[PDB]
Amino acid sequence: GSSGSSGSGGTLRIYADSLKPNIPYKTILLSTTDTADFAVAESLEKYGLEKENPKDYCIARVMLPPGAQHSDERGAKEIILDDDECPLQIFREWPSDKGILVFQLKRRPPSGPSSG
């Protein structure tokens, strides 16, 4: 047992445009404390991945460049997160000037580029 669900907490739009193309975007109730792993799993289950390994997938945040003003995600570069980060808190205190922030769900680099 566990008591929770109070107030609002926060929301996070997990587009994850890759792991699940069929589905457009996903939104799960996130908090200003939860970790990535948690979200990952959640996001997974949401899409219907209640089996896959959430430890394999992480929450890669995509930040828009400073010199962008024409299209969307204009040559945006995402940077995987540690693991015990906050995809909600981060955004909550994310500078718009730095560019839009997006949290996609996709595999992370284990050790070096290109897993293969």
Side-chain angles (χ1 to χ4, degrees), residues 12-21 23-30 34-55 57-60 87 103-107:
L12 233 302
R13 264 170 223 72
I14 321 298
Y15 300 101
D17 258 331
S18 245
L19 206 66
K20 267 243 167 202
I23 300 90
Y25 74 103
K26 277 280 189 196
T27 49
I28 64 141
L29 263 274
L30 236 50
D34 278 312
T35 40
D37 181 351
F38 178 87
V40 156
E42 293 276 58
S43 170
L44 292 153
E45 307 201 70
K46 293 286 254 141
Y47 280 123
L49 284 319
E50 58 162 270
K51 279 219 236 239
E52 305 255 42
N53 238 52
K55 271 247 291 218
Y57 314 149
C58 229
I59 315 285
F103 285 109
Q104 323 295 72
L105 173 90
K106 42 81 91 160
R107 233 231 306 197

Side-chain angles (χ1 to χ4, degrees), residues 80-99:
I80 281 286
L81 313 160
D82 251 290
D83 229 359
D84 49 71
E85 279 249 272
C86 284
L88 172 52
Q89 202 205 299
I90 281 169
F91 159 96
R92 300 254 67 190
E93 286 219 310
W94 172 253
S96 59
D97 208 277
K98 280 199 114 222

Side-chain angles (χ1 to χ4, degrees), residues 15 61-79 87 90-103:
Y15 300 101
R61 56 168 171 168
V62 192
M63 313 138 273
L64 279 278
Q69 234 301 277
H70 178 194
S71 263
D72 300 81
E73 293 105 71
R74 242 228 94 64
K77 264 242 220 128
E78 83 224 55
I79 308 160
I90 281 169
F91 159 96
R92 300 254 67 190
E93 286 219 310
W94 172 253
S96 59
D97 208 277
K98 280 199 114 222
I100 264 297
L101 181 92
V102 205
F103 285 109

